Design a protein around this ligand. Sequence first.
Ligand SMILES: [Cl-]
Ligand SMILES: [Cl-]
Lengths: 143, 144
Amino acid sequence: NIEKLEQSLTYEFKDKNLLIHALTHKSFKKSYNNERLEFLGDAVLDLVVGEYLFHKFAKDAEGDLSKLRAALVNEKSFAKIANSLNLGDFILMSVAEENNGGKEKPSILSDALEAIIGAIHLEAGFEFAKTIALRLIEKNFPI
Amino acid sequence: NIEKLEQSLTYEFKDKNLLIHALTHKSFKKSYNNERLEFLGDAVLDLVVGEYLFHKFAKDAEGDLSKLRAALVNEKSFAKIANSLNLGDFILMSVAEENNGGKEKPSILSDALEAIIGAIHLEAGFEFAKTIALRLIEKNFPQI
Ligand SMILES: [Cl-]
Ligand SMILES: [Cl-]
């Protein structure tokens, strides 16, 4: 069913397993989860948003850029974007995790979104991941 | 003299003033300094190093990738890299800041290095900035 997600992203994965990896919560399967991709995606997003703010607010001091970036690159914002993509429908987690409300946990939603951006960067490069991420941000925060 | 720094960076600036900008400490001139470029470059470097480690340590958990990144992306390491480029020789700062040892401060050296990488990213893009940054990192710190 991940095809629906690809359509929402405007990005079709060459390696489908890579998207599944990004969608795999830590509860699901031994030694296979989205934590490394989330690490990579978070670094991607800090550059995407930092660069965006640097250009958009040419007169803003570093402190302003930093705080504005914190206001965008965070669990709440990413969980919002995740929900706009119905990510809870695609994330893989154990029965117990789902019964404990995992599909609605902001951390799980946020982590999966960041891992997806990491996965797009891995497969397609920074500039591509940037264009995808900026579209999602501009649809959710029309700043 | 600036050509010497470019030679050390193995990168020739298209816009020379951009490099000047990256080299301008906050003490030097009102409303013009390297702090915004440092912010941008720090983000570039966190991605360059995060990606490098992600691939180099394909098995490592996030905690281990983060520790390895902290071993590279830090003031002490960046100041060492800056010193390898003789960066203190090129940083612009007030007389007072210079007399107070500013060209020798690891924070100032690190900031200027990160600002230079930000500037390269700005004019040439991420992949070029990544190439330059990794050369500097590997020339200094092949053990990580
Ligand atoms: Cl991975
Ligand atoms: Cl600037």
